[PDB]
């Protein structure tokens, strides 16, 4: 009777930015975890670690899901042993991986005539990002040996800066949204995995 | 802001050779540095750059064979091959919306002779 | 990669009528565009830094505007003191795209 609300978190009209991206834990389900691939088209399904077909045979504990926005070239920056502007400030992966990584166009949905300036992202930063944290706060950013005044001249930024989205850019800057699952090494006894 | 080079001259094929781009009134340790070289009545083209992070990107003709390296700007070279000569410049290149962010050097020489 | 071509490089005119240059793009770029002005001897200055949108403190003597792939840039009379040479650029330094630099005319 109980089935993870899967639908809540593919079909939600509001998706979180990405320097600000939601976690969700999972835990005691039965689950469809071959629902995806006949759910609906997806574009991109890629994997690592377990091949598909050992997912509802193999029995987890918990689950972790997130989801976020980008713009289409940068699906591959989302992967283990790569580096980039996302990769280092945004969102970081770690060496080991055993989750999927699901990426679907959304090009009529949110994109209307005047365009999207709601989403966001980061482009200045001191140092690299360590594995698994979320950031939320903004202040001002200083190049500079002298310490940043309060008016931001000449030496001092504004960190955050938007996309924007119109319908008639070309195939490779219309907007994505991504979904990354993931799952732990346990020793409390199992509570999530497929039906019989 | 103020940017000064210093280095290069004579020198021959098969030996490394050190590049002094000591900045001045500049933080090099948070700036997206990057090398760019002039050849003599050509086009300008791309050589390297840097984040504030420790990485590295290169270009197509140059196959891992320089290194760069950050309140100082440092380059090397790596068995020179005959086809590299000309000016080199240290940018430190427009990110974002702000104006102001250009900033170049002056200039500098190689030449392999004996 | 992106591949860059110009309009005929020498070029020269009379005071009083513009010039136009053009600037063509292989792989779908957008709005990435600078016009690094640049004189002999001297490292170049950007002059326009995104599209349409043209660098502040100096004199609105240069008209550019433009989006999609192909560009235009004009000036609408070449003093004598402004004569130069002009490059076109695609700012990035993603892994998909270097950055590249076009052919430039001399003016």
């Known amino acids: 009777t109980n089935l993870c609300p899967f639908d809540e978190v593919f079909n939600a009209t509001r998706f979180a930015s990405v320097y600000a991206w939601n976690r969700k834990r999972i835990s005691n389900c039965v689950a469809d975890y071959s629902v995806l691939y006949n759910l609906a088209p997806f574009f991109t399904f890629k994997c690592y670690g377990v091949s598909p077909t050992k997912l509802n045979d193999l029995c987890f504990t918990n689950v972790y899901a997130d989801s976020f926005v980008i713009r289409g070239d940068e699906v591959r920056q989302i992967a283990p042993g790569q580096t980039g502007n996302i990769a280092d400030y945004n969102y970081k992966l770690p060496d080991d991986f055993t989750g999927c990584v699901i990426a679907w166009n959304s090009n009529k949905l949110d994109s209307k005539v005047s365009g999207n300036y709601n989403y966001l992202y980061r482009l200045f930063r001191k140092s690299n990002l360590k594995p698994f944290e979320r950031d939320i706060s903004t202040e001002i950013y200083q190049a500079g040996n002298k310490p940043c005044n309060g008016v931001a001249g000449f030496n001092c930024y504004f960190p955050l800066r938007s996309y924007s989205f119109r319908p008639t850019y070309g195939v490779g800057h219309q907007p994505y949204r991504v979904v990354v699952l993931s799952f732990e090494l346990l020793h409390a006894p199992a509570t999530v995995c497929g039906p019989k | 802001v103020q940017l000064v080079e210093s280095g290069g001259g004579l020198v021959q094929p098969g030996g490394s050779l050190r590049l002094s781009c000591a900045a001045s009134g500049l933080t090099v340790s948070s700036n997206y540095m990057n090398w760019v070289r002039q050849a003599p009545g050509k086009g300008l083209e791309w050589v390297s750059v840097?984040?504030?992070?420790?990485?590295?990107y290169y270009a197509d003709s140059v196959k891992g064979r320089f290194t760069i390296s950050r309140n100082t700007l440092y380059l090397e070279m790596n068995s020179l091959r005959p086809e590299d000569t000309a000016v080199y410049y240290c940018?430190?290149?427009?990110?974002?919306?702000?104006?102001?962010?250009?900033?170049w050097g002056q200039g500098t020489t190689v030449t392999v002779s004996s | 990669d992106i591949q860059l071509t110009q309009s005929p490089s020498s070029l020269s005119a009379s005071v009083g009528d513009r010039v136009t240059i053009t600037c063509q793009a292989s792989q779908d770029i957008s709005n990435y565009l600078n016009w690094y002005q640049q004189k002999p001897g001297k490292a170049p200055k950007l002059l326009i830094y995104?599209?349409?949108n043209l660098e502040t403190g100096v004199p609105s003597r240069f008209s550019a505007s433009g989006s999609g792939t192909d560009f235009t840039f004009t000036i609408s009379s070449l003093q004598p003191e402004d004569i130069a040479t002009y490059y076109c650029q695609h700012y990035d330094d993603l892994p998909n795209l270097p950055p590249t630099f076009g052919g430039g005319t001399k003016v």
């Open positions: 995104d599209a349409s």
């Open positions: 940018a430190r290149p427009i990110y974002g919306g702000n104006a102001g962010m250009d900033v």
């Open positions: 840097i984040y504030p992070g420790g990485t590295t």
